[PDB]
């Protein structure tokens, strides 16, 4: 594994989502000033995410999440990639 | 650190063996024999 | 009679090698999935001197 | 705690559990999608009081239906491994302690390690002042940012 | 076909260990300085030696401890006959090996009935108070 | 008479060694020693052994013995890092102790007058309070010293009145010939406590469960060189002495052995049942160790052989195996100074062969076969279900909890995650490795020869 493919593989679920529209993606585009998905569709993109994984989110750290490139940061620490 | 434990083993086995090999060869020796 | 015996005793001698460098080495269990086979190429012949005379011990 | 993360994390939950039990990929979409339109279509927007009350149905809604066993998956509590390598991850100041036969054999590491130790000896006294700085009496708050050095 | 025929090549196998043993025995053959049996004459026993004297007491003791033993050797022998018989059965037995259970049965209870509640500190003037019971 | 001289010998050995070189002196001659021990364990098949007119060496005493005599090199190996910063003339003053104490037991063991058995039998009282009042660490040991002294002692005096007492009403007070002279004492009143007068000290110094408070707060507190000897053996020799005075009593011990049955039957499960929640480990051993003993003294009072061959080999396997366990604990003890077993969590992770021994020990406390422990313990099992068809059902809790705390020992102070912080530990010397080594292979070979460990029955 590789943070290339973290941030491939992050996105390439990211565009899937319905409610985002693909092109205004960015990997530091944000999650609620920009987007406005809200958190209720919040819980659904971060559980789907991670279930592409099989890797488990914690709750407070779900908490924050937001963009997608402080994701991709946070999957690179836990697997210490 | 697996150093201590190894060398532990070498010297304990080294002197059992030490002691040990005299013996089992004269128990051997003894029953050819006489 | 030396047969069953002979097809027990020889598991013994591995857990020996135990404290001997192959142990150490990352080559000791083939030598053991080998001994188990030895053990019951040498374990069927019991069995058969077992069937057709039909003998027990 | 605060009220809306609660019924959030509420919601994760559930539908954790809801997939416990839809099993297949298709009926656990459809139940979802049914699920999130029951927590909008019902009270998205309402007064505090009330909506306290619809978690206290919800939490025994839930509880009677939360299913014997969810899946979990092996990093997490439950776990069909949760501690599987912890007999490993052995703590790095054991190792400075091999003696020198055994250290010699890792030149690099070594050096680099010492490059380490030699960084954070020399950086505690910042830490210290301004963990000093940073902090009131003592608040709720862990840890506190970086200004110039080390953190 | 007989599978059996396998034996004889397993019986070169042997074959090796019988010739070894000459060259064992042989060499053990030539020298032989050698140990016989002892034997123990008899005494006189405690019922006849009087209230106070130690040393009737005592050779009497010994006397009876060595014939105790003895006995428990003689019982290890007709178990171990036991033994023989019902293995070698094929399965049948409550044959030969009722009449080895036959005597059996009268010698454990003859030994049964010397050697019982005697309890530890077992000595030769309690069997005698026993006997008199 | 040839083995004791040289015991003395050492003595003057110690005080005139060289300052920086009495550990080896003292060590490498107290081996030798035991080798000449080990001599004397021939023994006859019918007639007890005899020497001096005051000397004998009955089978029930030799291995004992040779226990005894091999236990002192044990003790220097574990002492020897425990104590550096003390003073030459202390140290030097500090193994005489220790071998002071041996002298008395070897004396003791071979009897032969119950006298003299008796006088030495408490004299061994002094330097083991010298060394757990001196040497031990924290407060607390002060107060046990007096609960380890007056227990024996409101024990043993009654029992020698009582002694005085049988060679004024018979003739000599020496064994053999009251082994034959002996006859039997019975019911009325005088001889009851008679009875008890002749029974209570032996039952005190090997701990029975309702007078056993004082060995648990010995053992928390002596230093480990006093542990070893106050678990592996001085209990081991009220047992010894216990089988010894039974030559005697008769038929009374059939009238009289049921309330002890009662406190050792049910203390036992009881003391195992303590033994599952202590707070820190050096404790635990010691309930463990009741636990063990209530079995012997069963054993000996119900007074059928198979029960005194099994006395004899659980008192042996016992000896080895508790002092192993504490050992092997105070290596812990040093290594983190936590005494509490919570704080030394993933001890194994951090080194292994420590856990293979607490492996072994562990493994051989629960009593799983071959070990003499067990054989030793089945024995007494077989002749308690003969005295009782009940009994079984108590002896078979015991042979539950003790298979649980055992094992919760390892488990819990080894197996999963590491302190972080605990920075302290130092991947294991050489003696240390050398001393449990030195306890379990004994232990391991003595399995294949136990008919000469059984015992005189």
Known sequence: ?81 | ?34 | ?57 | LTHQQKVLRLYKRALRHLESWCVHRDKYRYFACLMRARFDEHKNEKDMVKATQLLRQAEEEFWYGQHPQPYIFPESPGGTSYERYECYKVPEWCLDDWHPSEKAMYPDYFAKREQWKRLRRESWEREVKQLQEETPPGGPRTEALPPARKE | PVTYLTKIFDLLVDRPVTLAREFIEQQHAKNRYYYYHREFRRVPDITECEEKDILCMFEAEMQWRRDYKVDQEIVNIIQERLKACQQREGESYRQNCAKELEQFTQVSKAFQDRYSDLGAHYSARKCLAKQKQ | ?457
Not at chain 1, 11 to 21: A, E, G, S
Not at chain 6, 194 to 217: D, E
Not at chain 6, 333 to 350: C, D, F, K, N, P
Not at chain 6, 351 to 376: C, E, F, K, Q, V
């Open chain 2, 1 to 34: 650190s697996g150093f201590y434990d190894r060398r532990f083993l070498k010297l304990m086995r080294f002197y059992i063996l030490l002691t040990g090999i005299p013996v089992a060869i004269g128990i051997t020796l003894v029953n050819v024999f006489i």
């Open chain 1, 1 to 81: 594994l590789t943070l290339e493919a973290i941030k491939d593989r992050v996105l390439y679920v990211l565009k899937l989502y319905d409610k985002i529209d693909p092109e205004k993606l960015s990997v530091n585009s944000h999650f609620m000033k920009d987007l406005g998905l809200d958190s209720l569709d919040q819980v659904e993109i971060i559980m789907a995410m991670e279930d592409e994984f099989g890797f488990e989110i914690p709750d407070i750290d779900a908490e924050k999440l937001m963009c997608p490139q402080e994701i991709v940061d946070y999957i690179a620490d836990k697997k210490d990639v």
């Open chain 6, 1 to 457: 008479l040839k083995i004791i001289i040289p015991t003395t010998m050492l003595l003057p050995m110690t005080w005139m060694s060289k300052h920086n070189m009495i550990w080896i002196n003292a060590t490498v001659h107290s081996l030798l020693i035991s080798l000449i021990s080990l001599s004397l364990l021939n023994q006859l098949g019918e007639n007890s052994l005899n020497f001096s007119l005051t000397f004998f060496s009955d089978s029930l005493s030799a291995p004992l013995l040779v226990l005894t005599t091999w236990l002192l090199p044990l003790m220097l190996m574990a002492s020897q890092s425990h104590l550096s910063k003390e003073t030459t003339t202390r140290k030097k003053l500090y193994i005489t102790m220790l071998i002071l104490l041996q002298l008395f037991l070897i004396m003791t063991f071979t009897a032969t007058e119950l006298i003299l058995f008796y006088i030495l039998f408490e004299a061994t009282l002094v330097p083991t309070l010298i060394i757990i009042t001196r040497w031990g660490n924290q407060t607390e040991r002060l107060n046990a010293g007096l609960y380890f002294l007056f227990y024996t002692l409101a024990g043993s005096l009654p029992l020698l009145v009582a002694l005085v007492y049988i060679q004024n009403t018979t003739g000599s007070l020496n064994f053999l010939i009251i082994h034959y002279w002996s006859h039997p004492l019975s019911n009325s009143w005088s001889n009851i406590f008679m009875w008890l007068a002749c029974i209570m000290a032996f039952m005190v110094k090997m701990p029975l469960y309702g007078l056993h408070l004082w060995l648990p707060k010995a053992h928390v507190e002596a230093p480990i060189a006093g542990s070893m000897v106050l678990a592996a053996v001085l209990l081991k020799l009220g047992g010894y002495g216990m089988m010894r005075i039974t030559t005697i009593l008769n038929p009374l011990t059939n009238y009289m052995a049921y309330p002890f049955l009662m406190l050792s039957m049910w203390g036992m499960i009881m003391t195992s049942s303590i033994c599952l929640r202590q707070t820190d480990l050096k404790s635990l051993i010691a309930y463990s160790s009741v636990s063990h003993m209530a079995l012997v003294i069963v054993a000996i009072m119900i007074q059928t052989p198979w029960s005194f061959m099994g006395a004899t080999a659980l008192m042996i396997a016992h000896g080895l195996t508790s002092s192993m366990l504490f050992c092997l604990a105070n290596t812990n003890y040093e290594r983190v100074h936590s005494r509490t077993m919570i704080l030394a969590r993933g001890l194994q992770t951090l080194l292994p062969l420590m856990a293979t021994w607490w492996l072994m020990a562990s493994l051989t406390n629960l009593a799983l076969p071959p070990s003499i422990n067990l054989i030793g313990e089945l024995f007494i099992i077989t002749a308690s279900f003969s005295w009782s068809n009940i009994t079984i059902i108590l002896m078979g809790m015991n042979m539950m909890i003790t298979a649980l705390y055992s094992l919760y020992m390892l488990i819990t102070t080894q197996r999963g995650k590491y302190t972080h912080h605990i920075n302290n530990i130092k991947a294991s010397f050489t003696r240390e490795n050398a001393l449990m080594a030195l306890h379990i292979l004994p232990l391991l070979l003595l399995t294949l020869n136990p008919k000469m460990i059984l015992g005189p029955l």
């Open chain 3, 1 to 57: 009679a030396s047969l069953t015996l002979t097809t027990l005793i020889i598991l013994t001698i591995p857990i020996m090698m135990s404290n001997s460098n192959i142990y150490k080495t990352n080559l000791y269990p083939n030598y053991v999935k080998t001994t188990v086979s030895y053990a019951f190429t040498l374990s069927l012949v019991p069995l058969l001197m077992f069937m057709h005379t039909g003998q027990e011990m």
